Amino acid sequence: LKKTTGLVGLAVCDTPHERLTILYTKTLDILKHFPKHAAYRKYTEQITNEKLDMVKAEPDVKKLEALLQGGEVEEVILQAEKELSLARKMLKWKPWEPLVEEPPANQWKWPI
Amino acid sequence: TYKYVNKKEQESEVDMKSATDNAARILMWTELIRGLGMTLSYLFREPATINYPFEKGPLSPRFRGEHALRRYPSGEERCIACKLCEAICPAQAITIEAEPRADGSRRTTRYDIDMTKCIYCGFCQEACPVDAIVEGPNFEFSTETHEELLYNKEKLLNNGDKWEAEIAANIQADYLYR
Amino acid sequence: TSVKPIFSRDLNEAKRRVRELYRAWYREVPNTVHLMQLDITVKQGRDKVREMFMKNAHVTDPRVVDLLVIKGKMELQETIKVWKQRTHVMRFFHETETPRPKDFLSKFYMGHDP
Amino acid sequence: MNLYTVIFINILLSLTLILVAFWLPQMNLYSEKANPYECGFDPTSSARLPFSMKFFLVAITFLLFDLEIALLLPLPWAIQTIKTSTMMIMAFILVTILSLGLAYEWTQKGLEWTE
Amino acid sequence: ASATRVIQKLRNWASGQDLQAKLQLRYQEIAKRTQPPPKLPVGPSHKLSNNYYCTRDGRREVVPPSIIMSSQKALVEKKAVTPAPPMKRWELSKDQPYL
Amino acid sequence: LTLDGIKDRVLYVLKLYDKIDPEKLSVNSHFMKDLGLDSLDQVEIIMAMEDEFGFEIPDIDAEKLMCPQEIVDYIADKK
Amino acid sequence: RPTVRPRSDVTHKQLSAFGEYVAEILPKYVQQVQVSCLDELEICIHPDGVIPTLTFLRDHTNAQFKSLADLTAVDVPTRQNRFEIVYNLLSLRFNSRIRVKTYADELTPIDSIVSVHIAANWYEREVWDMFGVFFFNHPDLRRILTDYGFEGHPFRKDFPLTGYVELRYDDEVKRVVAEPVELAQEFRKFDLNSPWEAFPAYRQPPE
Numbered sequence: 078l079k080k081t082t083g084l085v086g087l088a089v090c091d092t093p094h095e096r097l098t099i100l101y102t103k104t105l106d107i108l109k110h111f112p113k114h115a116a117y118r119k120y121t122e123q124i125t126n127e128k129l130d131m132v133k134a135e136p137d138v139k140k141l142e143a144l145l146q147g148g149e150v151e152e153v154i155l156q157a158e159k160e161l162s163l164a165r166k167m168l169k170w171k172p173w174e175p176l177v178e179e180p181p182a183n184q185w186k187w188p189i
Numbered sequence: 190t191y192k193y194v195n196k197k198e199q200e201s202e203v204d205m206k207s208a209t210d211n212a213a214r215i216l217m218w219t220e221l222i223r224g225l226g227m228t229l230s231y232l233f234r235e236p237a238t239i240n241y242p243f244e245k246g247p248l249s250p251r252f253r254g255e256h257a258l259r260r261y262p263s264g265e266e267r268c269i270a271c272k273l274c275e276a277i278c279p280a281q282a283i284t285i286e287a288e289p290r291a292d293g294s295r296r297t298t299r300y301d302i303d304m305t306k307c308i309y310c311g312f313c314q315e316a317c318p319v320d321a322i323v324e325g326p327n328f329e330f331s332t333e334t335h336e337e338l339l340y341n342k343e344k345l346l347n348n349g350d351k352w353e354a355e356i357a358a359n360i361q362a363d364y365l366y367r
Numbered sequence: 368t369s370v371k372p373i374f375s376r377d378l379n380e381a382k383r384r385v386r387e388l389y390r391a392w393y394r395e396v397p398n399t400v401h402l403m404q405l406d407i408t409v410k411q412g413r414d415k416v417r418e419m420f421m422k423n424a425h426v427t428d429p430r431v432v433d434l435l436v437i438k439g440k441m442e443l444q445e446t447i448k449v450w451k452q453r454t455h456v457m458r459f460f461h462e463t464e465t466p467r468p469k470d471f472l473s474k475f476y477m478g479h480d481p
Numbered sequence: 482m483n484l485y486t487v488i489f490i491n492i493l494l495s496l497t498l499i500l501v502a503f504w505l506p507q508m509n510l511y512s513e514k515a516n517p518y519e520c521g522f523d524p525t526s527s528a529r530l531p532f533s534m535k536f537f538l539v540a541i542t543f544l545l546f547d548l549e550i551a552l553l554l555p556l557p558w559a560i561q562t563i564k565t566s567t568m569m570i571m572a573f574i575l576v577t578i579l580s581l582g583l584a585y586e587w588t589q590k591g592l593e594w595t596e
Numbered sequence: 597a598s599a600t601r602v603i604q605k606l607r608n609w610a611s612g613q614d615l616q617a618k619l620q621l622r623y624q625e626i627a628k629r630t631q632p633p634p635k636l637p638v639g640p641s642h643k644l645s646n647n648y649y650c651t652r653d654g655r656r657e658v659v660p661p662s663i664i665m666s667s668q669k670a671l672v673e674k675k676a677v678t679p680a681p682p683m684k685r686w687e688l689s690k691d692q693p694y695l
Numbered sequence: 696l697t698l699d700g701i702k703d704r705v706l707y708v709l710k711l712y713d714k715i716d717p718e719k720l721s722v723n724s725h726f727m728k729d730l731g732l733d734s735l736d737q738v739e740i741i742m743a744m745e746d747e748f749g750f751e752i753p754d755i756d757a758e759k760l761m762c763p764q765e766i767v768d769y770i771a772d773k774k
Numbered sequence: 775r776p777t778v779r780p781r782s783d784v785t786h787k788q789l790s791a792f793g794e795y796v797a798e799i800l801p802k803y804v805q806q807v808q809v810s811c812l813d814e815l816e817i818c819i820h821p822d823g824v825i826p827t828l829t830f831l832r833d834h835t836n837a838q839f840k841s842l843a844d845l846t847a848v849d850v851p852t853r854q855n856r857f858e859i860v861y862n863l864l865s866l867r868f869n870s871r872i873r874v875k876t877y878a879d880e881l882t883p884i885d886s887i888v889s890v891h892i893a894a895n896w897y898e899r900e901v902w903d904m905f906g907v908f909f910f911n912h913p914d915l916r917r918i919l920t921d922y923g924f925e926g927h928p929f930r931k932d933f934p935l936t937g938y939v940e941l942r943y944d945d946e947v948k949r950v951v952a953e954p955v956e957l958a959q960e961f962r963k964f965d966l967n968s969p970w971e972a973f974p975a976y977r978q979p980p981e
């Protein structure tokens with residue numbers, strides 16, 4: 078029903094509920110491979126679960142956008158797939174590990 | 190708030206009269222004729238050009254022009270060799286070598302201002318505590334050599350003696366703001 | 368002791384990169400002299416390239432050798448293009464300035480400089 | 482003879498003007514002055530390399546349309562003919578097939594500057 | 597301003613807009629170049645009393661930045677947070693939406 | 696594999712190097728030991744061989760190449 | 775007090791909470807998190823985690839900092855790693871700004887973030903040109919602001935203000951030639967430091 082997104086290069090992307098649904102479920106499924114103590118896993122599961130809950134709760138596009146507060150629903154879709162890409166990259170990395178190296182003692186001392 | 194500059198609200202559909210209007214706009218070059226009329230009106234307006242060397246452009250008493258060293262009404266030089274104008278000079282364009290005079294007064298022996306280095310910012314004249322250095326209204330002082338723009342104390346005092354009838358009036362008109 | 372390399376584990380592959388860069392400069396000198404209308408000959412330019420490599424040829428740190436190779440590649444790239452001009456490529460020769468003599472008598476005759 | 486004299490007078494006038502332009506002022510020629518311009522830098526290329534124009538099909542079509550022009554130009558004497566019906570039909574057919582060729586090229590994107 | 601009526605009519609018709617009302621040459625409506633002298637006000641902290649500098653010394657209110665976590669000083673269920681609440685969408689202008 | 700042609704063209708390059716060989720070369724003469732050269736002169740010789748034979752010698756085998764004899768046998772087993 | 779700024783403890787608390795959030799999400803790289811009294815959040819990380827930290831901040835759902843405002847370097851030539859590389863990032867979704875710091879020396883390069891933000895191309899070219907900090911995997915890393923044959927990195931603290939060479943036209947060679955610098959004025963340094971301390975809050979403990 079929406080004619081344009083208003084942002085150049087952002088397609089109209091009809092049936093956004095199914096697309097958001099599959100993106101959020103893929104994000105959850107790839108978050109299941111993270112360690113249980115991973116703070117990224119815990120927080121991203123919280124974010125994805127609450128956004129999936131509100132996308133299942135609200136069937137109207139305008140009211141769903143008002144609830145999500147992430148701009149247009151196409152912006153929300155783009156952010157969801159970028160979060161999925163970040164989840165893959167953070168599975169390839171292992172940021173939950175301890176600090177790789179302490180800095181020197183005067184590295185972050187200002188003023189000198 | 191915000192507004193759109195090129196987005197249109199709905200459409201005006203297709204109509205024979207609107208189609209004929211658009212066709213006449215395309216074929217008869219109506220916006221081109223309109224631009225022709227606009228520049229024709231500008232042709233029949235009065236130009237804003239002033240006759241330059243006889244009618245000068247308007248200015249203000251705050252105007253920063255050519256530097257000058259002023260004097261008291263007794264004729265004594267105002268400068269007291271305190272060097273804070275060259276301390277504040279952002280281009281380091283001033284050199285203020287100084288020594289006690291024959292009567293023991295604190296005066297300058299070398300006061301050089303490099304006008305090719307100066308950025309004409311007025312920080313010296315707003316820093317001077319005795320209103321000695323000023324930036325008077327002279328701007329038509331272009332020279333044919335680089336050396337003539339390397340002023341010394343004699344040149345600056347000559348400019349102060351030349352332009353005092355105007356500099357004093359400008360400072361009178363301006364000093365309550367500063 | 369226990370530093371992080373940037374390209375080369377040790378001096379051997381650093382010297383390999385140096386040789387590759389020197390080959391590239393040696394090949395590019397005739398094209399530079401032909402394209403930019405240089406007064407010099409091909410022999411003079413190749414001798415200048417050898418002189419620059421020799422004046423950098425006393426360092427035994429692999430990271431420093433790699434950084435010198437990188438900067439030489441950048442200089443070679445802007446010489447491959449005509450980003451550098453005749454003035455830029457003739458700045459290597461110092462044709463105008465007189466060199467300061469290396470003897471104590473001359474450095475005593477002029478200036479208070481060591 | 483008259484037109485010949487006027488042509489030669491104009492040619493001699495242009496030659497006189499450029500000879501005055503070349504022998505009047507003072508010359509000071511050196512290499513950096515007479516180098517090619519290139520916006521204040523040395524040119525990378527020799528300005529004689531291939532240029533690769535993008536409207537080559539339009540140029541060939543211009544050749545064909547110029548010869549169609551040459552065909553169409555004797556019309557002011559053609560309309561003085563005694564038949565005028567075959568003349569009118571022939572002119573209509575010629576203009577129509579020229580327009581059909583232009584329309585076919587436009588449809589096949591010939592005049593679209595393929596990069 | 598010194599133009600005939602016929603030329604003014606021609607200019608207005610050719611421009612499509614009234615030009616004598618907003619002509620771009622300044623004649624007399626500008627301020628006089630000689631102005632009466634001003635009397636600029638003094639700001640606050642000219643009070644001669646209850647005006648100690650230590651009570652309005654904003655330059656020395658600056659503190660070093662507070663360390664949240666440190667790899668040296670600290671040597672180290674809850675909800676996910678954001679750097680700020682998400683920005684509310686702009687409203688379309690009412691005087692001229694021009695949409 | 697035209698061994699004599701490879702050998703005397705390599706010797707032609709070495710003679711027309713204009714830095715070395717005042718009747719001092721041999722087929723088994725070392726560059727660093729006998730000719731008194733270094734790595735930059737050696738890679739100049741290698742580039743001269745490339746410019747004369749029309750094929751590229753990489754750096755991995757040029758650095759183990761030491762004498763005109765290994766030049767001629769390397770060119771032979773390459774061709 | 776009409777001469778002192780307001781404080782906004784609410785946004786100070788918000789930035790502190792988000793600093794805790796990022797520091798616990800990325801403990802492998804985050805070395806320090808601080809919030810200034812000007813309400814600016816700085817996260818000082820190990821140089822190995824520049825790519826993961828910048829990717830997390832580019833596209834995390836709660837941390838959309840998709841716009842890179844600034845990428846600069848600060849030469850502090852008294853620490854062991856003398857260059858502090860600073861990224862200023864902007865969040866249009868949450869209307870916030872974050873600052874990410876890492877360190878380098880003259881022989882320790884940092885991975886470029888051109889794959890994350892494309893403005894980092896020219897910004898890292900400027901950092902390399904002005905400080906000599908090399909960047910790994912940078913497409914066409916080269917000088918951007920210095921002269922073509924320029925030697926040295928002029929924004930370093932040990933580089934002179936006037937440089938080492940100057941240009942003049944020479945009529946014998948008909949060129950613009952470079953000479954060792956000789957000033958006719960000799961820029962006068964001013965010792966504008968009061969011998970009395972101005973801010974007791976920053977008084978360092980004695981050695």
Ligand code: SF4
Nearest residue numbers: 278307308310311313
């Ligand atoms: S106007 Fe500014 S730059 Fe010029 S002499 Fe005064 S202080 Fe220096």
Ligand code: SF4
Nearest residue numbers: 268269271272274317
């Ligand atoms: S001109 Fe004024 S500020 Fe400068 S040294 Fe003299 S008294 Fe001081």
